Design a protein around this ligand. Structure first.
Ligand SMILES: CCCCCCCCCCCCCCCCCC(=O)OC[C@H](COP(=O)([O-])OCC(O)COP(=O)([O-])OC[C@@H](COC(=O)CCCCCCCCCCCCCCCCC)OC(=O)CCCCCCCCCCCCCCCCC)OC(=O)CCCCCCCCCCCCCCCCC
Ligand SMILES: CCCCCCCCCCCCCCCCCC(=O)OC[C@H](COP(=O)([O-])OCC[N+](C)(C)C)OC(=O)CCCCCCCCCCCCCCCCC
Ligand SMILES: CCCCCCCCCCCCCCCCCC(=O)OC[C@H](COP(=O)([O-])OCC[N+](C)(C)C)OC(=O)CCCCCCCCCCCCCCCCC
Ligand SMILES: CCCCCCCCCCCCCCCCCCCC(=O)O[C@H](COC(=O)CCCCCCCCCCCCCC)COP(=O)(O)OCCN
Ligand SMILES: CCCCCCCCCCCCCCCCCCCC(=O)O[C@H](COC(=O)CCCCCCCCCCCCCC)COP(=O)(O)OCCN
Ligand code: HEC
Ligand code: HEC
Ligand code: HEM
Ligand code: HEM
Ligand code: HEM
Ligand code: HEM
Ligand SMILES: CCCCCC[C@H]1C(=O)O[C@H](C)[C@H](NC(=O)c2cccc(NC=O)c2O)C(=O)O[C@@H](C)[C@@H]1OC(=O)CC(C)C
Ligand SMILES: CCCCCCCCCCCCO[C@@H]1O[C@H](CO)[C@@H](O[C@H]2O[C@H](CO)[C@@H](O)[C@H](O)[C@H]2O)[C@H](O)[C@H]1O
Lengths: 85, 54, 383, 244, 383, 244
């Protein structure tokens, strides 16, 4: 499924013209400030839920479990610990 | 800029020689600079600072 | 013809590091492969150097490690580099495997590099397990004892196999000397399998974040990905620097600075952090043999991803529901890791069982269901 | 587990060596050596430290040679093969108070005082644990605590009952530099000294770390420039398509 | 398409061990390559096993070898197999190199496999030298001392380099522990170079005893050469059996059963037999640095055979004068070996110098002259 | 070198163990143990041999336990950490006559009697050298030989002057099996015993060798048949050429 240069396995290409300029002719950091702020904000906003939802759920579950475990091993939690074991 | 390019950059042999010479100088000067800075932020704490009492 | 292409030896190197045609749109998650190569090179360099100063005999082992720390020039650095890079090796390998699962790198035509990859991961685990025993501190000894006693669960022959592994009736000098020899060897085996999985990959080439063919638009490995890999090499070296020079013991267990004592049992025997999720899976099953099977199955089940993923599309970039499921799967795997080092106490016991069920149900139920439904949604949604 | 079973967590004290660019205070190390020598060394060894280790850290070559030369060590047998002793040298290790574990336990009601060379790394908490433990013996155990025989109450120790009694009291040591030897001062000095004993590369390691951080950061910045420079023809590529 | 050809991993194995096209007329001197592979596999298996029972610390090393001999089940066999196979490895390598020189295997287009072969031979020498030190008997210590002091001849920095190699001011514990780590490593390096020289060969294929092309008439590697290689595998195992089981110490020095003693100097410090010719060459030159250079040059001069052989015909099958010269060259190399273990006494001193001159004059004078004259004789003789 | 500097080469004696299929004579091994124990052990150790090694070779389990139990070995310290002795066990090594080299040399006019556990492998000649040396002290040194003080003439020893005197004389041992204890008999038995001590796998090794030889020879024969079978189409190939 992959060939090599000259016969890479692409369907025939035709009709596309590609253009570019030398690295010495270009500003490598052109538009860096706009990208760093606006592009990153757009990219982050669109992915935020896929991180927030699972992280917040599993952090909540952990927090509840760790707090219960702590409470069960106090004096106040003696009776509930006895039942839990 | 032309002169500088022509002497130090154009020939890779010269470019590599200049990079290695610079690395040598950097290495020696950076050592000395860090040593002095480290001694100033940790002044009075090191053996070299209390050695004179003994 | 250029010499790099004409000469057969040069041409093999050329094919992997220079002319190798790569997709033009690999993101920074494609940098973990070369970081893993860097960890391997550091472990070989530091490990062979430690082997010049270490003594594998149980009467001298722990003291030889103190001699390295105290007397060998830069011995402290070489030891801390080796110990911390073992952790970084696992961070990079989990990132690399996470990328592979998210982007569908296990799908045809890349089943074979993925399957060899699963073996690489098992070899890493064994290598790191044996290396940790070599210190012969309290955790070294007691971790070896508990982990090797899992083999006793093998029916009929299990006990005999354990005595054979130990070279005696408990973990002692014979065990330590054999772990040294095998710890030295296993990284060479691992380097071979790493090379094999890249040769297998080279038939299809790298996948890419869109999941489509890159045969339409290729870039040479050098200079593009060479220079992209340097960025993460230096990011890695900065992380490495902060641990090795400023916090060299953060990732370790203080009990491993106590010499092994078969009489005294440490308060808690836990594996190194990178093994913790597998340990939580083992604890979840009450049966001894059950627990062992589940723990092995938790790794071997990666081999069925090419089958249970029913999607007609490679990878998750365009699959919102798959992305959510993947996020839950990852966070569950981290929670299993945390539960691997809590005490066996309520309510962590039941939590560990629910998380274990979710871990397996991702492969067996959820991914096949979600991938089936998304196929239908793509087709109906775009009619 | 109960909090008692874990032991109370020690406070985070502001040690001189806390801080990415901070060394130990060598004057505190010297004073801590003197506390080890006059208090702890009755029960605890420091077996991984040789006399040469103190030189240029806490003591001069001559002071350390003087400490070594006051002791007797086993020499090679004489010409009739009979045992002999020699005076100590800089290469020798600091000798412990007991010949073996059995002697150590017999002197300490069954408990074995650990070697202290690695103790700062061998306990969660490090210097903070050592300082907290030494200064954390309450006059009276909390009401209800039953101590086993030969145990002392100390909340920092897991379980609460430790076989080591309180040993630091105001003025048990007379410091040679005139520092007032309070319980707190001696605990701070000895904790600093034991931290040094566990990690004697500390000062050098952190200075080399500073050099590494600077170089690696600069190289990271330059590698970003060079990557972006080389990639700009790809990033800037434009297409015009005319369907055939 | 057959799976062996279709699958890229299988296809690489296929290319070397199965479909590999070989000349149909290879004689039994083409069997040494697979015997060398067998020696390497035995050394890896026995060496890794010894490493599980050996202790590299100078206080325990010699005793760990006695523990292997006396207490480890079949330890005596594993040790004797490892020690004797080291000798067999050199017999096979000299046969293999002898075949290559007689048949012109170093000529174009096989300069590159031959040149990598010269490095393999150097790596074998270093590997075996370090392994012999590990016993830490009298010959181990004293051989390490005299051989490592040759480095002192390097001008200006020589003494500093020796102290750096030793890790101290004489051969001691630091030296032994580093030799263990490097002895473990070097065989893996050697296996890589062995593979490289076969990849380089695979472009031209094997030469054959007639020196002509075999492109006209090829045979698959399997089954023909597979089954031919088994004959010499069993012949080798019979020789191995007679040494390991019936005369396990014949090839060794009794002094290596005395523990290393820096005070007492053994009567005669000689290298293992397979290094003796190089030692005689060193002795021949009175100057220390001169002797070192000559000894290294005696191996590196193999690299110029592709240049000094002026023949238009590959190999010696049809060259009566070249065959006679080759016979003298071989017997001289054996005489140098014998002179490497005589005492430095008359008349062996002058004999060693004459044999040394003849060794070098084969490459520099005789082979270029004889090959030039034979070219003319073939042309005029067949007019 | 002169022949004197090399030492005379020992005769090749027909040992029972010479011979591809021959074991040691175990009765000679037992007698040789008794010579070691009653003569050599005054000056020479056998440090690599444990009591368990004799069992099923020269002695029964009970005889060897009896030898071990007659001696005292260092135990673990008692509860006050004081030294203690225990009776020997089968696991213990046979103890040597001297605490150290210095004591050994002092007892032997400066010479150090070597440990004999490996001596049969550590000398050219093996058993033949040991037998020749023990039986080769002439009554008088050859005229002209000047012995250094405390040296004895023995031509088998390189240089001729050995620090060990003749020790085997007719009837210094009374064998428990009734064999006449002549110089020659005792030298033969002790040489056999020391050969066993150097190579205790000997008997097993040679029997496994016999099995290996047989199997490998058969496999060599069959591999020749199979090679010739597979190659016969190539060897038998014939050609007819008709030039185009
Ligand atoms: C070590 C590990 C053990 C494994 C052993 C492997 C050795 C096998 C090998 O390479 O040699 C066998 C080899 C038989 O191999 P072959 O493939 O039948 O013939 C190879 C020769 O090119 C064929 O040479 P040729 O056909 O001209 O026949 C010459 C040969 C006769 O060779 C015969 O076998 C007959 O006889 C001699 O040269 C003997 C010299 C006369 C002395 C008196 O024996 C020799 O011919 C040795 C000649 C060397 C001098
Ligand atoms: C923690 C939960 C992670 C959820 C990830 C969901 C997607 C997301 O927002 O990621 C951003 C990006 C989204 O990238 P993308 O390639 O899907 O989208 C690029 C932008 N568009 C859609 C416009 C083309 O995801 C990645 O880059 C994911 C790589 C996964 C690595 C996981 C490591 C975990 C290790 C555990 C191993 C077992
Ligand atoms: C000892 C001296 C050896 C002289 C060899 C001369 C040729 C000869 O008769 O050999 C028989 C055969 C002759 O084979 P041939 O291939 O020339 O001839 C076959 C028969 N005819 C001519 C009809 C086609 O030679 C070999 O097989 C030589 C292999 C050389 C291996 C040398 C090992 C020495 C190791 C030292 C390394 C440095
Ligand atoms: C093996 C582990 C690899 C990780 C190396 C990172 C740091 C280790 C360097 C040792 C060190 O402490 O160096 C410091 C400077 O760091 C630095 O400046 C080194 C960081 C440079 C990053 C890596 C660049 C190449 C390194 C790898 C190449 C090795 C082989 C190639 C020939 C200060 O030490 P110092 O300055 O006092 O030292 C004496 C010369 N004055
Ligand atoms: C590594 C070294 C390789 C060389 C092996 C030669 C013999 C080693 C085995 C020990 C031995 O002497 O075996 C004898 C039988 O000979 C034999 O039958 C063994 C000779 C066969 C030689 C070649 C066969 C395989 C060698 C390597 C294959 C590796 C694959 C799996 C290990 C004794 O027999 P015993 O009584 O000790 O036997 C136990 C079961 N009765
Ligand atoms: C006369 C006895 C004695 C003196 C004096 C003494 N110790 Fe100890 N120490 C012990 C004993 C006994 C233990 C073991 C306690 C146990 O395990 O119950 C111990 C334990 C410790 C521990 C380890 C506690 C743990 O977590 O396991 C540290 C740290 C310690 N000592 C430091 C010191 C320092 C610092 C000093 C003095 C400046 C000191 N000790 C003085 C007897 C002593
Ligand atoms: C009372 C002293 C003494 C007795 C008894 C003794 N030896 Fe020795 N033996 C020595 C000394 C001393 C040497 C060292 C001689 C030397 O190196 O000059 C020695 C050396 C040897 C050597 C090594 C010679 C060499 O080549 O280096 C052998 C073998 C030997 N003894 C065997 C025996 C045997 C067998 C017996 C008795 C059955 C025996 N010895 C009895 C004192 C003794
Ligand atoms: C994949 C590569 C490797 C990994 C993941 C790895 C992992 C480890 C680990 C976790 C330890 C315990 C470290 C500690 O806490 O002190 C260790 C110790 C050790 N490793 Fe490795 N290792 C690797 C390669 C090697 C190699 C190639 C050698 C060559 C001998 C080696 C030699 C050692 C030695 C001698 C020790 C004991 C001394 C010490 O603890 O630092 N390692 N290794
Ligand atoms: C020593 C450990 C490893 C090393 C050095 C390594 C190295 C690499 C490298 C350099 C690549 C190509 C660049 C990249 O995608 O990152 C790659 C790709 C890959 N690796 Fe790994 N790898 C290792 C372990 C693993 C493991 C454990 C797995 C799987 C469980 C795996 C599966 C893959 C797959 C499927 C690919 C192709 C991914 C793609 O381009 O789409 N590897 N590896
Ligand atoms: C080309 C492969 C090798 C060669 C030529 C070789 C050669 C040698 C030699 C000559 C000795 C001295 C043997 C003796 O007289 O006792 C030796 C010892 C040793 N070798 Fe190797 N060796 C090889 C591979 C290995 C490997 C891969 C290991 C893995 C650790 C290893 C481990 C040892 C050890 C532990 C010893 C010391 C114990 C002993 O003397 O038997 N060797 N080797
Ligand atoms: C570990 C050591 C070595 C191994 C395993 C090895 C293996 C082999 C094998 C299997 C072959 C093809 C079959 C044959 O001709 O015998 C071969 C050919 C060859 N080897 Fe080696 N070899 C080793 C060392 C060397 C050395 C030291 C040299 C050169 C100084 C050398 C030079 C060559 C050459 C030139 C060939 C092609 C010969 C021809 O077919 O005409 N090899 N080797
Ligand atoms: C030296 C000749 C032997 C050929 C193998 C050498 C290494 C080799 O192939 O290099 C390449 C640089 C490779 N990276 C890639 O493919 C790559 C492809 C796409 C994108 C990126 N980066 C994106 O941003 C990549 O980085 C890599 O890191 O792989 C190592 C593991 C290989 O080492 C080995 O297997 C031997 C041992 C160290 C495991
Ligand atoms: C123990 C060693 C570890 C594993 C290494 C496996 C063997 C070494 C293989 C690396 C060499 C691969 O390098 C290349 O591979 C291809 C793929 O088969 C082979 O290619 C060769 O066989 C194929 C078909 O079998 C032919 O179409 C081709 O003309 C020929 O060159 C050659 O061998 C080599 O040109």
């Amino acid at each position: 499924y992959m060939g090599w240069w000259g016969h890479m396995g692409s369907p025939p290409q035709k009709g596309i013209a590609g253009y570019t300029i030398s690295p010495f002719a270009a500003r490598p950091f052109a538009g860096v400030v706009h990208a760093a702020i606006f592009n990153t904000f757009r990219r982050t906003k669109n992915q935020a839920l896929f991180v927030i939802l699972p992280v917040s759920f599993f952090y909540y579950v952990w927090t509840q479990a760790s707090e219960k475990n702590e409470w069960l091993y106090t004096k106040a939690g003696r009776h509930e610990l006895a039942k839990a074991l | 800029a032309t002169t500088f390019y022509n002497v130090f950059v154009k020939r890779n042999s010269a470019f590599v020689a200049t990079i290695l010479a610079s690395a040598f100088v950097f290495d020696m000067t950076f050592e000395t600079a860090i040593d002095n800075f480290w001694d100033r932020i940790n002044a009075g704490k090191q053996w070299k600072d209390i050695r004179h009492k003994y | 013809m250029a010499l790099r292409k004409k000469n057969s030896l040069l041409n093999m190197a050329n094919s992997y590091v220079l002319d190798s045609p790569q997709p033009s749109n690999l993101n920074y998650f494609w940098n973990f492969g070369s970081l893993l190569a860097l960890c391997l090179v550091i472990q070989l360099a530091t490990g062979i150097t430690l082997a010049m100063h270490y003594t594998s005999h149980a009467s001298l082992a722990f003291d030889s490690v103190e001699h390295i720390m105290r007397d060998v020039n830069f011995g402290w650095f070489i030891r801390y580099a080796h110990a911390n890079t073992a952790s970084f090796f696992f961070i990079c390998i989990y990132a690399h495997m996470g990328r592979n699962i998210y982007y569908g790198s296990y799908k045809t035509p890349r089943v074979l590099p993925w399957s060899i990859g699963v073996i690489i991961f098992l070899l890493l685990i064994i290598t790191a397990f044996m290396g940790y025993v070599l210190v012969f501190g309290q955790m070294s000894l007691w971790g070896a004892t508990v982990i090797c006693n899992l083999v006793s669960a093998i029916p009929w022959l299990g006990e005999d196999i354990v005595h054979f592994l130990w070279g005696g009736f408990s973990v002692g000098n014979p065990t330590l000397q054999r772990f040294f020899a095998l710890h030295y060897l296993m990284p060479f085996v691992l380097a071979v399998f790493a090379l094999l999985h890249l040769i297998a990959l080279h038939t299809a080439g790298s996948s890419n974040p869109l999941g489509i063919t890159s045969n339409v638009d290729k870039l040479s490995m050098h200079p593009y990905y060479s220079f992209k890999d340097l960025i993460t090499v230096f990011a890695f070296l900065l992380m490495f620097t902060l641990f090795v020079f400023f916090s060299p013991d953060k990732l370790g267990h203080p009990d491993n600075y106590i010499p092994a004592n078969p009489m005294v049992t440490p308060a808690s025997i836990v594996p190194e952090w990178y093994l913790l999720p597998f340990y939580a899976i083992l604890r979840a099953i009450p049966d001894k043999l059950g627990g062992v099977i589940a723990m092995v199955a938790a790794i071997l089940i990666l081999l069925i991803l090419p089958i249970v993923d029913r999607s007609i599309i490679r990878g998750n970039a365009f699959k919102p529901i798959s992305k959510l499921l993947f996020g839950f799967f990852i966070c569950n795997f981290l929670l299993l890791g945390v539960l691997g080092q809590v005490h066996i106490e309520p309510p962590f016991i039941v939590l560990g069982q629910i998380c274990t069920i979710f871990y397996f149900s991702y492969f067996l139920i959820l991914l096949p269901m979600v991938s089936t439904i998304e196929n239908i949604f793509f087709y109906i949604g775009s009619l | 587990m109960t909090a008692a079973e874990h032991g109370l967590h020690p406070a985070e004290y502001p040690w001189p060596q806390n801080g990415m660019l901070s060394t130990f205070d060598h004057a505190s190390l010297r004073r801590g050596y003197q506390v080890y020598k006059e208090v702890c060394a009755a029960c605890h060894s420091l077996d991984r430290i040789a006399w040469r280790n103190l030189v240029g850290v806490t003591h001069t070559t001559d002071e350390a040679k003087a400490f070594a030369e006051e002791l007797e060590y086993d020499d090679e047998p004489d010409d009739e093969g009979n045992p002999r002793k020699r005076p100590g040298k800089l290469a020798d290790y600091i000798p412990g108070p007991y010949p073996n574990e059995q002697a150590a336990r017999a002197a300490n009601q069954g408990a074995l005082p650990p070697d202290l060379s690695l103790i700062a790394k061998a306990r969660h908490g490090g210097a903070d644990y050592i300082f907290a433990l030494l200064t954390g013996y309450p006059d009276e155990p909390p009401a209800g605590v039953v101590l086993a025989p030969g145990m002392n109450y100390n909340p920092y120790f897991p379980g609460g009952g430790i076989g080591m009694a309180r040993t630091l009291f105001d003025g048990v040591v007379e410091y040679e530099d005139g520092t007032p030897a309070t319980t707190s001062q001696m605990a701070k000095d000895v904790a600093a000294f034991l931290t040094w004993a566990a990690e004697p590369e500390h000062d050098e390691r952190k200075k080399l770390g500073l050099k590494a951080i600077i170089v690696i950061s600069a190289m990271l910045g330059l590698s970003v420039y060079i990557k972006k420079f080389k990639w700009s023809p790809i990033k800037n590529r434009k297409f015009i398509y005319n369907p055939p």
